Design a protein around this nucleic acid. Structure first.
Lengths: 85, 82, 205, 80
RNA sequence: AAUUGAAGAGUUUGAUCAUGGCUCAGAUUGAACGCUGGCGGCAGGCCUAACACAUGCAAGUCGAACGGUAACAGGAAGAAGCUUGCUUCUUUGCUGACGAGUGGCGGACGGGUGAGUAAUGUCUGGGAAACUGCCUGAUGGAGGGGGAUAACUACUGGAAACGGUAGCUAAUACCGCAUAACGUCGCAAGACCAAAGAGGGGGACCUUCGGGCCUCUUGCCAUCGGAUGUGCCCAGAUGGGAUUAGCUAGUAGGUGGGGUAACGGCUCACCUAGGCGACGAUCCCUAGCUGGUCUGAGAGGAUGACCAGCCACACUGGAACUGAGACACGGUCCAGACUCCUACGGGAGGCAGCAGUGGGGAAUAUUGCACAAUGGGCGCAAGCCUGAUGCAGCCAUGCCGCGUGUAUGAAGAAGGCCUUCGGGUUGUAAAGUACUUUCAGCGGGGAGGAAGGGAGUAAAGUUAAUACCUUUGCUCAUUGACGUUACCCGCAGAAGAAGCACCGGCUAACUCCGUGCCAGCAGCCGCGGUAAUACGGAGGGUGCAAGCGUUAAUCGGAAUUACUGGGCGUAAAGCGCACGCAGGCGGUUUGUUAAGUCAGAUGUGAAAUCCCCGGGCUCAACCUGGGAACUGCAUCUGAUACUGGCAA
């Protein structure tokens, strides 16, 4: 409707696309981690955890994951590897 | 933002402003944290016209509160005594 | 909002002189007082208990020239004030500005005093008060303005002020034509024959 | 100190939890008679030491399940 | 000083006393209707169709973030009529600025409505497992690069709405890289995580002579605090129905995984078989809740329009996206009903914002003026926006104030009505006479709501700088929608200004005439069938008064649900009689506890409202200062007589 709501519509669409991509990459890295924990692999899962840590902290800082969630992930996953190793 | 601001309470064509401390996104005559003085722009030429608790104002500005232009003008009017 | 009719008729239903035509002459002499308030006025009423209470309230209102919502508000204010509600009610009726102008001899009647008050001929404390029911505080000076001073009425009215009893709670002085309401009138200082317990009991039913 | 309550165990049979009836003794607002009045509470206990018919003190904590915001401190008076 | 507070009557009977119902007298209202209507002040105004909506406004702003120039006005340069001295035209964002666009912030506030919701809500009191844009304090960082994409241009699809394709460009847009804590994870060892510039001014130096460089202001990032706001939990309280007694399988709990900002059946797998319920679950009807309002002596009863706090909703049903915050009134998506446009392929809309329409209804307002004030958004500010708000319009809808004159005046005029025809009454009423001008009308004068903001100085601070900026004084023009304002003065003349109900008893106030169980009246008792104080008219009176009556609704009276504060032999009312569980109550003495109870303290019980003492509007209504109050709850400290617990 005829306003500056049109601009918020198009910006929220653009940011929807950007956030969906970054959120999807973050979730795939976390799937790498506890999909490596599905098999009994310690150092493979540690390599995947070191691969996911900067991106989850980074998406926490960029403002789309709200860092407590960031913390939870790494906390949960650390538990999984010292349940395993 | 919390704001020390005026809030219109008198009758029609006869305002009495009460200076309060409100969360700034409330209504004018709505919800406030504490009232801290008043300002009658008439009152008569008698004694006061305005009293205003400077200790609580200094407390809230210490907390981070902002002050509108009228309340700043009233503090610049009642400076310490006059 | 005020009466505007035959006055001595009101004074004749009550059976008592309500001072409604004080004016030039002496005691009525052309009223046929007591005799006939209407066509069947020669009949004795055999009045009820509601009739005596009602008729007492009407006596007081028709004296002071007050209508019912205003009188009723005086009863509420006299009730809430501390003390004796009959005496408080007469103290509220006696502090009326038109009454104080009548007591000082500035008007011949209370309606003439009410027209002096109404036609901006009266100041209290050096400010002109246009209102019949202004409530005169103690230690006030109420006077006539320079306009409507030395008009005939007030002079004649002061002429008939000496025929009456000179109320104790005033400073009547007619030289300068200014007066001082000094204190509230005591119940024992006024009129002695109105029964205010009847109007307390009238409003308390 | 902490605010706590006392009550008795009304039933027992649940997997590391208990339920406690509290007896508050309150005056009727209209009638002016002091009337007993209960408050059943789902109360947590680690390792379920208290059985049925006990008396136990009880404090409030974070939520531990649906209702269940209460946890014991001291089991007293277990006498059967 | 803050509770000075309580009325009855009519009607059962031939009469009585009691019981008992019905009814009246009071106060109130978002009121409507009937008759009447002068002025002002302050308030209030769709209670019904959460029905459908024409039209106009209700949310924008910033160039001191960025590419840029669509206009407007200048500047520079060129050419021309050339009056060689002024105009016309053109290239240049060069400048003040600015359409469109990117970007930041706001559109989650403000404003509306009460549909749903009987307890995921509200009120009161506790709590822990939290997030928090803007605002504030502290500690520090703010280095070095890259790829894009709008706008723009060129085609192109479409009736339109709206797109598509190919190139170009910027940033405080976006992304890496470095850096790394008193940050995240981890027991540690360690691992890992961010950023953005812009503006004002300037001595010297270096200029690829655009600017580097210095300084100030402002912005960015990280962490820890604070304040505010929000999310979550518990206990108690907050309608009616038992002619609704069983309800519940993610249901109740546990373990582990996931999820959220955060605890949690929030979710899933497995294990246990619980959980709720007669202290009323479940079902059904109704309903937004509160501060409060009305009534009441009070306790209560009814209610929750305005004003303020909370919740919920935004055509209907659902969903998420962006964001600090929404599952979003003037956002997105889908579906549905309706309405509209169409080239028939498809599109568009959402007044329960403010005015306004149509409809519904007994009923409820202007398609107004202004941002001057107060507040909000944006902005360094100027300022722009603001149907919030200030005001104005209409309406007796309420409350309050004032007016319609005042004094005199007996020939007790005339006329009306009654009359025992003597007179009485209307009635000092009118007329006459003498005064006054409130308000309305006319003409002048004229506060206050106006504080700020702008432009020059002077001083101080900062600094390399006597710049720039900030602060404080001083000076100069100014800033009012209301508004021919409030108010004051002058003018002319009583001149423009009184109705409505009632008169048998209750209930204040009476006769005549007309009608004759009719016409009709009525709240109850009941009037009217020929001399009606009850009907209809007249005279007279009574009550209220710019109002007055009727109707609807609430409380009172009603001690006719009785807690305060009732009853049960015969008026209604003792189960047909017992036994007895849960429940209620419990002799007497001592000791302990202190739960009830009592006393004090602290925190809270929002503000307004009620009450008290004051203050301002000429008074009043109204506004307002301080107190009291909010009868409560929680915690701590005590007392231990009574009740309870425990022991004897």
């Amino acid at each position: 409707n005829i306003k500056s709501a049109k601009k918020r519509a198009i910006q929220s669409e653009k940011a929807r696309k950007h956030n969906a991509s970054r959120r999807s990459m973050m979730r795939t890295f976390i799937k790498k981690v506890y999909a490596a924990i599905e098999a009994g692999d310690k150092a493979a899962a540690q390599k995947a955890f070191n691969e996911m840590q900067p991106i989850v902290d980074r998406q926490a800082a960029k403002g789309l994951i709200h860092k407590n969630k960031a913390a939870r992930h790494k906390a949960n996953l650390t538990a999984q590897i010292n349940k395993l190793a | 933002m919390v704001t020390i601001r005026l809030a219109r309470h008198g009758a029609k064509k006869r305002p009495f402003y009460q200076v309060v401390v409100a969360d700034s996104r409330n209504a004018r005559n709505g919800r406030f944290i504490e009232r801290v003085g008043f300002f009658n722009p008439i009152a008569s030429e008698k004694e006061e016209g305005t009293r205003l608790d400077l200790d609580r104002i200094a407390h809230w500005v210490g907390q981070g509160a902002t002050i509108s232009d009228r309340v700043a003008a009233l503090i610049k009017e009642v400076n310490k005594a006059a | 909002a005020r009466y505007l009719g035959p006055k001595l008729k009101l004074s004749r239903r009550e059976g008592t002189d309500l001072f409604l035509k004080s004016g030039v002459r002496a005691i009525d002499t052309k009223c046929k007082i007591e005799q006939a308030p209407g066509q069947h006025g020669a009949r004795k009423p055999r009045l009820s208990d509601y009739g005596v209470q009602l008729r007492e309230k009407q006596k007081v209102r028709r004296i002071y020239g007050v209508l019912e919502r205003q009188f009723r508000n005086y009863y509420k204010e006299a009730a809430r004030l501390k003390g004796n509600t009959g005496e408080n009610l007469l103290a509220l009726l006696e502090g009326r500005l038109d009454n104080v102008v009548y007591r000082m001899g500035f008007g011949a009647t209370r309606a003439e005093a009410r027209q002096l008050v109404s036609h901006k001929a009266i100041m209290v404390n050096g400010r002109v008060v246009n209102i019949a029911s202004y409530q005169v505080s103690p230690n006030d000076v109420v006077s006539i303005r320079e306009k409507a001073k030395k008009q005939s009425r007030v002079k004649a009215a002061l002429e008939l002020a000496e025929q009456r009893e000179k109320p104790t709670w005033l400073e009547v002085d007619a030289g300068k034509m200014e007066g001082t309401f000094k204190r509230k009138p005591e119940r024992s200082d006024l009129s002695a024959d109105i029964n205010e317990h009847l109007i307390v009991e009238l409003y308390s039913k | 100190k902490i605010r706590t309550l006392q009550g008795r165990v009304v039933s027992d049979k649940m997997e590391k939890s208990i339920v406690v009836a509290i007896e508050r003794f309150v005056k009727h607002p209209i009638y002016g008679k002091f009337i007993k009045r209960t408050t059943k509470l789902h109360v947590h206990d680690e390792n379920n030491e208290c059985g049925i018919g006990d008396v136990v003190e009880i404090r409030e904590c974070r939520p531990l399940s649906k209702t269940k915001s209460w946890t014991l401190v001291r089991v007293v008076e277990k006498a059967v």
